[PDB]
Scaffold this active site. Structure first.
Site, mmCIF file in Angstrom:
data_model
loop_
_atom_site.group_PDB
_atom_site.id
_atom_site.type_symbol
_atom_site.label_atom_id
_atom_site.label_comp_id
_atom_site.label_asym_id
_atom_site.label_seq_id
_atom_site.Cartn_x
_atom_site.Cartn_y
_atom_site.Cartn_z
ATOM 1 N N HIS A 1 0.802 -1.206 0.000
ATOM 2 C CA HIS A 1 0.000 0.000 0.000
ATOM 3 C C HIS A 1 0.842 1.267 0.000
ATOM 4 O O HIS A 1 0.327 2.362 -0.162
ATOM 5 C CB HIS A 1 -1.016 0.020 1.165
ATOM 6 N N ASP B 1 -0.046 -7.534 1.432
ATOM 7 C CA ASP B 1 0.465 -6.172 1.424
ATOM 8 C C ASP B 1 1.990 -6.221 1.491
ATOM 9 O O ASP B 1 2.579 -5.910 2.522
ATOM 10 C CB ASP B 1 -0.113 -5.395 2.614
ATOM 11 N N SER C 1 4.275 1.676 8.411
ATOM 12 C CA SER C 1 4.020 0.682 7.371
ATOM 13 C C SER C 1 5.246 0.401 6.507
ATOM 14 O O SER C 1 5.973 1.319 6.114
ATOM 15 C CB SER C 1 2.882 1.150 6.464
HETATM 16 O O1 LIG Z 1 -3.410 2.887 6.453
HETATM 17 C C1 LIG Z 1 -2.557 2.028 6.691
HETATM 18 N N1 LIG Z 1 -2.364 0.875 5.998
HETATM 19 C C2 LIG Z 1 -3.008 0.421 4.872
HETATM 20 C C3 LIG Z 1 -4.029 1.134 4.144
HETATM 21 C C4 LIG Z 1 -4.636 0.579 2.971
HETATM 22 C C5 LIG Z 1 -4.218 -0.713 2.537
HETATM 23 C C6 LIG Z 1 -4.827 -1.281 1.366
HETATM 24 C C7 LIG Z 1 -4.414 -2.578 0.920
HETATM 25 C C8 LIG Z 1 -3.402 -3.303 1.627
HETATM 26 C C9 LIG Z 1 -2.787 -2.743 2.800
HETATM 27 C C10 LIG Z 1 -3.189 -1.452 3.254
HETATM 28 C C11 LIG Z 1 -2.587 -0.881 4.424
HETATM 29 C C12 LIG Z 1 -1.558 2.214 7.883
HETATM 30 C C13 LIG Z 1 -2.275 2.269 9.243
HETATM 31 C C14 LIG Z 1 -3.551 2.937 9.438
HETATM 32 S S1 LIG Z 1 -4.049 2.740 11.230
HETATM 33 C C15 LIG Z 1 -2.523 1.757 11.726
HETATM 34 C C16 LIG Z 1 -2.138 1.212 12.986
HETATM 35 C C17 LIG Z 1 -0.896 0.495 13.063
HETATM 36 C C18 LIG Z 1 -0.057 0.315 11.922
HETATM 37 CL CL1 LIG Z 1 1.450 -0.590 12.104
HETATM 38 C C19 LIG Z 1 -0.425 0.859 10.626
HETATM 39 C C20 LIG Z 1 -1.665 1.597 10.486
HETATM 40 P P1 LIG Z 1 -0.582 3.706 7.541
HETATM 41 O O2 LIG Z 1 -1.522 5.004 7.852
HETATM 42 O O3 LIG Z 1 -0.221 3.739 5.981
HETATM 43 O O4 LIG Z 1 0.654 3.741 8.366
#
Ligand SMILES: O=C(Nc1ccc2ccccc2c1)[C@H](c1csc2ccc(Cl)cc12)P(=O)(O)O
Length: 226
Positions: free
Chosen positions: A45, A89, A182
């Site tokens: 992502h 992912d 991430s």
């Molecule tokens: O939004 C997030 N991840 C994400 C968002 C959309 C995705 C769509 C398809 C596959 C994987 C995807 C992963 C992540 C995230 C949102 S709340 C949270 C709490 C703990 C962690 Cl380690 C990461 C995240 P990011 O804001 O990019 O750090």
């Protein structure tokens, strides 16, 4: 990294800071790691129109000689990557040139595990992600110790799958990975076992991490062909 502590500068040489460029929006950032001098592993992502990798960094606001900003020429997202379920992912980034091996920049060999890491085991994750819900991204590389949970702990994430992902972070503690982290690696016993993928927006752990082991075959495939 919520509830963590600032890393000892450059103590995690494989860490890669990623500035991601998209078409209709400001740049985003993610973590990731150097598995080969010219290959970085991260979260799918975190993909964009183009990406710039920065290795050898600690405080990303102040450029230092350890810095190595590299061009990404090709982004390899897992073929089955799903934006609604968030499965698979995982993404490999091939670098323009190979990075230089320094005290501040090196690779993290995607290992050779004899047995899967038993929940109850403590592992650690680093990153430059927010340090709180309404907090901004961290200027310096943070690090925290999180407990590998039984897959049941991640049941509320309706699309979580044990074979594909790891459940990380005790729910009784506030510590966890958060927005921004991430793509970073989860290390247990010094060996990368996961990749920060997602969690609750309110930051209540556990969090969902991609299970690297499961994609080892796909990773070698991309490597061997590029
Ligand atoms: O939004 C997030 N991840 C994400 C968002 C959309 C995705 C769509 C398809 C596959 C994987 C995807 C992963 C992540 C995230 C949102 S709340 C949270 C709490 C703990 C962690 Cl380690 C990461 C995240 P990011 O804001 O990019 O750090």
């Amino acid at each position: 990294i919520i509830g963590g502590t600032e890393c000892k500068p450059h103590s995690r040489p494989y860490m890669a800071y990623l500035e991601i460029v998209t078409s209709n929006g400001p740049s985003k950032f993610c973590g990731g790691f150097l598995i080969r001098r010219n290959f970085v592993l991260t979260a799918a992502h975190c993909a964009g129109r183009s990406i710039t990798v920065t290795l050898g960094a600690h405080n990303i606001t102040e450029e230092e000689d350890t810095w190595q900003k590299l061009e990404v020429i090709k982004q390899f997202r897992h073929p089955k990557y799903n934006t609604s379920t968030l499965h698979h992912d995982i993404m490999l980034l091939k670098l323009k040139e190979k990075a230089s091996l320094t005290l501040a920049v090196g690779t993290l060999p995607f290992p050779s595990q004899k047995n899967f890491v038993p929940p109850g085991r403590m592992c650690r994750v680093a990153g430059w992600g927010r340090t709180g819900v309404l907090k901004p991204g961290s200027d310096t590389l943070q690090e925290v110790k999180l407990r590998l949970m039984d897959p049941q702990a991640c049941s509320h994430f309706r699309d979580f799958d044990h074979n594909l992902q790891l459940c990380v972070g005790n729910p009784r503690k506030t510590k966890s990975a958060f927005k921004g982290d991430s793509g970073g690696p989860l290390l247990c016993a010094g060996a990368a076992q996961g990749i920060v993928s997602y969690g609750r927006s309110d930051a209540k752990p556990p969090a969902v991490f991609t299970r690297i082991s499961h994609y080892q075959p796909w990773i070698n495939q991309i490597l061997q062909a590029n």
